[PDB]
Amino acid sequence: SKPNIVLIFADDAGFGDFGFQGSTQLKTPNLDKLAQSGVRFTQGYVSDSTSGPSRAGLMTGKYQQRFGYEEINVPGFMSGNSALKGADMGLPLDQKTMGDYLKEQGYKTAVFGKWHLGDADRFHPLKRGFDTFLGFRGGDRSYFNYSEQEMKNGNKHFFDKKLERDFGNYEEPKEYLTDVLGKEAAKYIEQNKDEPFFIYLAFNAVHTPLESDPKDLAKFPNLTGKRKELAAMTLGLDRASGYVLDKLKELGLDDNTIVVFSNDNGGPSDKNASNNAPLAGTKSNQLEGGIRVPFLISWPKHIKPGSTYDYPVSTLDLLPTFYSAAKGKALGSDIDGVDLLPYIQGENTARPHKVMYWKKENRAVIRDNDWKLIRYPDRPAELYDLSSDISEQTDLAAKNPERVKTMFKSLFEWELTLERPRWLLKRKYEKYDIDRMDKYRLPATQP
Amino acid sequence: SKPNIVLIFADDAGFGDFGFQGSTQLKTPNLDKLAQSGVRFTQGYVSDSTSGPSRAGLMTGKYQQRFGYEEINVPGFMSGNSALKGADMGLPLDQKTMGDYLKEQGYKTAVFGKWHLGDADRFHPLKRGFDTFLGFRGGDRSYFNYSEQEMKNGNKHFFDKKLERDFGNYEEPKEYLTDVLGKEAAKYIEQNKDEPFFIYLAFNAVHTPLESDPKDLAKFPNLTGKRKELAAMTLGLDRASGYVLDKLKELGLDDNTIVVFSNDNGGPSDKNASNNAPLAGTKSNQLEGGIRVPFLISWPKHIKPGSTYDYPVSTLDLLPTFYSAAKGKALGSDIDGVDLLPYIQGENTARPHKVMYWKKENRAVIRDNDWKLIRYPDRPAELYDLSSDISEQTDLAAKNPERVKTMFKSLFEWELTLERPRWLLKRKYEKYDIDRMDKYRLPATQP
Ligand SMILES: O=S(=O)(O)O[C@@H]1[C@H](O[C@H]2O[C@@H]3CO[C@@H]([C@H]3O[C@@H]3O[C@H](CO)[C@H](OS(=O)(=O)O)[C@H](O[C@H]4O[C@@H]5CO[C@@H]([C@H]5O)[C@H]4OS(=O)(=O)O)[C@H]3O)[C@H]2OS(=O)(=O)O)[C@@H](O)[C@H](O)O[C@@H]1CO
Ligand SMILES: O=S(=O)(O)O[C@@H]1[C@H](O[C@H]2O[C@@H]3CO[C@@H]([C@H]3O[C@@H]3O[C@H](CO)[C@H](OS(=O)(=O)O)[C@H](O[C@H]4O[C@@H]5CO[C@@H]([C@H]5O)[C@H]4OS(=O)(=O)O)[C@H]3O)[C@H]2OS(=O)(=O)O)[C@@H](O)[C@H](O)O[C@@H]1CO
Ligand SMILES: [Ca+2]
Ligand SMILES: [Ca+2]
Ligand SMILES: [Cl-]
Ligand SMILES: [Cl-]
């Protein structure tokens, strides 16, 4: 029987900022129970440390740099020299999505919340294998309704923040957006309970702006400023996820539903007070704190409850995992991900990925087993043993010069399989990305 | 009195491949006498190790990466994702050229031979401060006439190879192109002998294809294959330069004429059998063999004959040097070059450039005094003391880790002042550039 698939994909959450990730300060009871119901990945990665490229990898099961989706698509932030600007930046139309693949297997498909895979009509979710959409095309938006005046006074890219149903039916949220998105996903489950369905629940929680339900803020009297907002926004993310998980149980769909929880990129600790403990770094850098994310898979009667899987896995793996579960027999020859199920169930004791890569311009990483080489524009390449140094504080480059040379050559061989980028950020953002990395160069710790 | 200015700019010549550069195999009598007539620079550099970007720096007196002219403009070789392709790649129109500056000082201005600063009409020499043109818009062409049929049946970029007078008056060369270009420059001197003139004589010699006057091939009976052609093509370059130098002497203009000889980039030893002795590397890499070039300045009664100048200088310096000689008092505030005359004459004993930079994508160089840091995509950054190690064979990076870190930060600070590139080569050419560098990693030696 073809299982339902629910992918809950948070935005800008701290690695440490869930109960199941070791938080005692924040409250995530619903997602903690999801963790206990299935397998928790201790080394789950996104394909990039920023939103657009991460989502391009997730949606395609491919290294997004292979189709030139290398730097983040941010209308108004792009170089005057960029090949594509504004609404023309998007997931190339020749790429086949997770939605397209599950549509081939007869699934009902919906996306709720953040898209960020292009603002033009041709890049719209309903053109990319999704039946149904309630969300926003761009990278961020308010958790409450925009006034008519705010929409009138927005710059030429502001339209991508407007809450939208399907193909251009604009209507602002009537309550806290996190609750709207969760309730919509639960309504869609109810409407499609008799047929295989795929939901992509792309919460904007816990992305800026720092806005919360006042009742949620009240539950954190001992937290201050940004961290109090993050706590409240996290409680909202967890409650809204709860609407979906509870609806599945209520309708008896638990045994025949795959639920995934992950996060688009590492926490931007300076922006939303996210905490990536015990990792160094943040959003937009390639330290573990930027690329390693909370990662759960639940499939009752198929995946052992309360289990952990400790070899590296990728958001790139989700497309082939979902497609195989959906009884798909025509996977494209170009997929970088692997079906995780044989690995999760111990049929395959090998690493799903011996070698993994990250790249934004001159900043790149090659990982070989637990060896991690990090290349930078502004400092010598660093080598970490992640099996003894999760926080990347002990540079072993000088002690292992032959391994550094061999990993450098392997990194460049992979770079040679990539397209040149399709769009380029203004020069100044490389300084912002590196300066924040140096601000969070030390390990984060649970408060 | 405003001096005449003649800039002879060869293409793809080997560093060692002139008598005045230490060759005992090749014949360059005319240019050897030019060297003896003036100052020879032992550390003269182009702004890039390839044609288009080198010429953009030369024409502007600016780091060409500041206006996004970073990778070479080669129609048909560009990424399908490139922002600008074919005829649209060119020196940005908001840049002010060497021609424009000397036109302001009342000079007659001419360019003969290779342009390579854009194929579209708007990038044409007669739009960029040149009165007159006989040459070709693109990067290479035959040293003999193309048939009407060859020109009709060429790909969509082939038109940029056609020999052109002024604004689209096409006529193929009636003899060996090197002789045509020299004789045209000599005719222009004759026509303008009573008025200040500037000639940019951009020979395609000694660029591929390997075609020579049979009478020149006859002067090298003991050489074979590519090296014989290079020898013959070099003798032609020297004779054609001779037409110009002999015309200046014949008309008594020697004492009031600045003559410069240089070369667009290091020798592509695999392509035209050029020899960069005693340097390592070649065209398209940032070893000394790619970026250091033969560099002569003659101004009889102003520059001491038979002298050498040993501090680093740049083609970027030629615009301000020329403009100051032309009595210009309104240099732009954006010029990276300096007027060399005070340095040559000992009015300024300081280094003209304490710091110099090169950049193509991930490949970059910072030089601080005689320290050279080289960054690569596929290997650890290398550090050379050029005052003890001209051939870049003793990597000091491990011995001097703090200097490596300091120069890395300074390199990135300069990168932050640049635009993103305006066009991007196909990915595969980075493999070709690096593999050839490794083929010529050892010092070249005089045959
Ligand atoms: O006048 S404005 O007050 O500032 O009006 C406000 C709203 O506009 C703003 O909206 C947010 C906040 O500031 C600007 C915009 O932020 C930018 O949003 C981008 C969305 O794509 C992007 O965020 S991201 O998607 O999460 O990556 C930008 O962040 C990136 O910038 C670089 C590229 O990658 C990283 C950086 O290197 C990434 O940084 S990060 O990792 O830290 O996130 C982010 O800066 C502003 O938008 S604007 O269009 O520029 O004006 C306006 O819409 C609203 O109506 O009013 C408010 C004021 O009340
Ligand atoms: O069958 S052919 O021999 O190909 O036909 C010939 C003519 O077409 C060719 O002409 C030459 C030979 O092959 C192509 C062309 O070479 C390319 O010319 C470019 C000019 O811009 C460029 O040279 S460059 O300007 O000096 O840089 C290309 O070299 C570069 O390529 C990459 C970019 O930088 C470097 C590389 O990474 C640089 O390499 S290098 O440093 O070694 O110089 C060079 O490959 C081909 O032209 S075509 O546009 O591809 O078709 C044809 O017109 C004529 O009619 O027939 C001849 C054969 O008789
Ligand atoms: Ca995000
Ligand atoms: Ca050249
Ligand atoms: Cl984001
Ligand atoms: Cl060239």
Alpha-carbon dihedral sign for residues A378, B78, A421, A319: negative
Question: Comparing C-alpha atoms, which of B240, B241, B219 is closest to residue B230?
Answer: B219
Q: What angle do CA B194, B197, B198 make, to 5 degrees?
A: 165
Query: What element of type H or E holds B270?
Result: helix B269-272
A428 and B416 within 8 Å at the Cβ level: the answer is yes
Pairing of strands B382-385, B371-375: antiparallel
- Cα distances from B333 to residues B62, B117, B336, in angstroms, run 11, 23, 9
Neighbours of B390 (CB within 10 A): 17
Domain that holds residue B272: 1-447
Q: Quickly tell me which residue has 């290349």 as its tokens.
A: A375
Q: State if residue A361 touches ligand 1 by the CB under 6 angstroms criterion.
A: no
What does the block give as tokens for A4? 């339902």
Picking from B82, B397, B409, the nearest residue to A420 by CB comes out as: B82
Q: State if residue B432 touches ligand 2 by the CB under 6 angstroms criterion.
A: yes
What does the block give as tokens for A343? 């690995």
What is the distance in angstroms between the Cα of A421 and the nearest Cα belonging to chain B? 7
Picking from B81, B416, B430, the nearest residue to A427 by CB comes out as: B416
- In chain A, the number of structural domains is 1
- Cα distances from A59 to residues A62, A200, A232, in angstroms, run 8, 10, 29
- Cα distances from B112 to residues A344, B106, B131, B201, B319, in angstroms, run 70, 20, 11, 5, 18
Provide φ and ψ at A282, rounded to 5°.
-160, 175
Alpha-carbon dihedral sign for residues B314, B317, B321, B323: positive
Asked if residues B199 and B6 have their Cβ atoms less than 8 Å apart, the reply is yes
Say yes or no: A435 contacts chain B, CB-CB below 8 A.
Answer: no
Say yes or no: B83 contacts chain A, CB-CB below 8 A.
Answer: yes
Q: State if residue B51 touches ligand 2 by the CB under 6 angstroms criterion.
A: yes
Q: State if residue A269 touches ligand 1 by the CB under 6 angstroms criterion.
A: no
Question: Comparing C-alpha atoms, which of B170, B176, B165, B172 is closest to residue B209?
Answer: B176
Residues of B in contact with A412 (CB under 8 A): 377-378, 434
Q: How far is Cα B303 from Cα B202, in angstroms, rounded to an integer?
A: 24
Say yes or no: A427 contacts chain B, CB-CB below 8 A.
Answer: yes
Say yes or no: B422 contacts chain A, CB-CB below 8 A.
Answer: yes
Cβ within 8 Å of residue B103, ≥6 positions away:
B109, B129
Say yes or no: A402 contacts chain B, CB-CB below 8 A.
Answer: no
Proximal ligand: closest to the CA of B157: 2
Residue in chain B closest to A430 (alpha carbons) equals B416
Asked if residues B209 and B118 have their Cβ atoms less than 8 Å apart, the reply is no
Which of A46, A50, A162 to mutate to test ligand 1, by most ligand atoms within 8 A of the CB atom?
A: A50
Q: State if residue B285 touches ligand 2 by the CB under 6 angstroms criterion.
A: no
Say yes or no: A405 contacts chain B, CB-CB below 8 A.
Answer: yes
* Residues near ion ligand 6 (Cβ under 5 Å): B 51
Q: How far is Cα B281 from Cα B289, in angstroms, rounded to an integer?
A: 4
What is the distance in angstroms between the Cα of A11 and the nearest Cα belonging to chain B? 28
* Residues near ion ligand 5 (Cβ under 5 Å): A 51
A420 and B79 within 8 Å at the Cβ level: the answer is yes
Q: How far is Cα B279 from Cα B441, in angstroms, rounded to an integer?
A: 9
Give SS3 for A53. helix
End-to-end CA distance of chain B: 45
Q: Which atom of ligand 1 is nearest to the CA of A161?
A: 53
What does the block give as tokens for B293? 């070039």
Asked if residues A215 and A184 have their Cβ atoms less than 8 Å apart, the reply is no
- Amino acid identity of A161? K
Q: How far is Cα A155 from Cα A141, in angstroms, rounded to an integer?
A: 14
Proximal ligand: closest to the CA of A266: 3
User: Breaks in chain B at C–N > 2.5 Å: after which residues?
Assistant: none
Residues of A in contact with B426 (CB under 8 A): 420
Q: State if residue B431 touches ligand 2 by the CB under 6 angstroms criterion.
A: no
Cα-based torsion angle of the residue sequence B11, B16, B19, B22 in order, rounded to the nearest 10 degrees: 160
Asked if residues A355 and A45 have their Cβ atoms less than 8 Å apart, the reply is no
Q: State if residue B268 touches ligand 2 by the CB under 6 angstroms criterion.
A: yes
